Amino acid sequence: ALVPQLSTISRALTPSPVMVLENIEPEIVYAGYDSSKPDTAENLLSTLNRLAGKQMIQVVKWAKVLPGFKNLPLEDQITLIQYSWMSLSSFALSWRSYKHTNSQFLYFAPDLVFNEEKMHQSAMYELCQGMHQISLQFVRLQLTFEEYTIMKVLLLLSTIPKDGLKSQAAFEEMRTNYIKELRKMVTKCSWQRFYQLTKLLDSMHDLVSDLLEFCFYTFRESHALKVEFPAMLVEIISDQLPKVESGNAKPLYFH
Numbered sequence: 001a002l003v004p005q006l007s008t009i010s011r012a013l014t015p016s017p018v019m020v021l022e023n024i025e026p027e028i029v030y031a032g033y034d035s036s037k038p039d040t041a042e043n044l045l046s047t048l049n050r051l052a053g054k055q056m057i058q059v060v061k062w063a064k065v066l067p068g069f070k071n072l073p074l075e076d077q078i079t080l081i082q083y084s085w086m087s088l089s090s091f092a093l094s095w096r097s098y099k100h101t102n103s104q105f106l107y108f109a110p111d112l113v114f115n116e117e118k119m120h121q122s123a124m125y126e127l128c129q130g131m132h133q134i135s136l137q138f139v140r141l142q143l144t145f146e147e148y149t150i151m152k153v154l155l156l157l158s159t160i161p162k163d164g165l166k167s168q169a170a171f172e173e174m175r176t177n178y179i180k181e182l183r184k185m186v187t188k189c190s191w192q193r194f195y196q197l198t199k200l201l202d203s204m205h206d207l208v209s210d211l212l213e214f215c216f217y218t219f220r221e222s223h224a225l226k227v228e229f230p231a232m233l234v235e236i237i238s239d240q241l242p243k244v245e246s247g248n249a250k251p252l253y254f255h
């Protein structure tokens, strides 16, 4: 006569966290690249920035439905996103390059694929090589989509403020849960692969530092360099630059 609150049906039908990530993976975004304009550094970079703005809008929508992310306080939900935006951007860039081009090119968007030439023309050739190296690693490792999605969540939880987050305890829980996910995922029916993946995540820090250095530089000199940044990026970079440059961003490592 009393309706049970617990639900055996609901509990069994609930998809795995790995299945939820697959369900919420953002759809590919177009850059709106106009090949009728010359491929100068000013145009290529502005285009990339516009693409970045469109991508971050989807990343935010992704962060709202991310399991466990809602357990953290709002302030720690914005800081983590502003701190890891470059890392998520570069890592998703490598995944698309790997899946869509076998890591032969940098697949920024279906309408914008960089070959060596555009890499030189972009005026950030070495950085492009840096991100392309990660794509090559996806091939040697035969990274799987499941491994990818988990790794991306970890990147979102890879950089925190020096003084700490509002809920450092809640943060530690979520990060631990996802590291577990990757742990059980890399398990054959294992430690060497888990090692290769963790070191891959760690290497993202130095790469991201280099990308950010170029980003902060082009941002402060955008007028002189004529590189346009969309609203979404001005917001993110205006908050991140003074924090990163002041030694207030702490990177988390596995090794």
Ligand SMILES: CC(=O)[C@H]1CC[C@H]2[C@@H]3CCC4=CC(=O)CC[C@]4(C)[C@H]3CC[C@]12C
Pocket (backbone or CB within 6 Å): 045, 046, 048, 049, 051, 052, 055, 086, 089, 090, 092, 093, 108, 124, 127, 211, 212, 214, 215, 216, 218, 219, 227
């Ligand atoms: C203009 C500039 O400084 C460049 C240097 C690093 C570049 C970013 C590198 C990573 C990246 C990957 C993408 O798929 C979208 C654009 C972004 C987010 C790039 C936007 C333009 C940046 C920020």
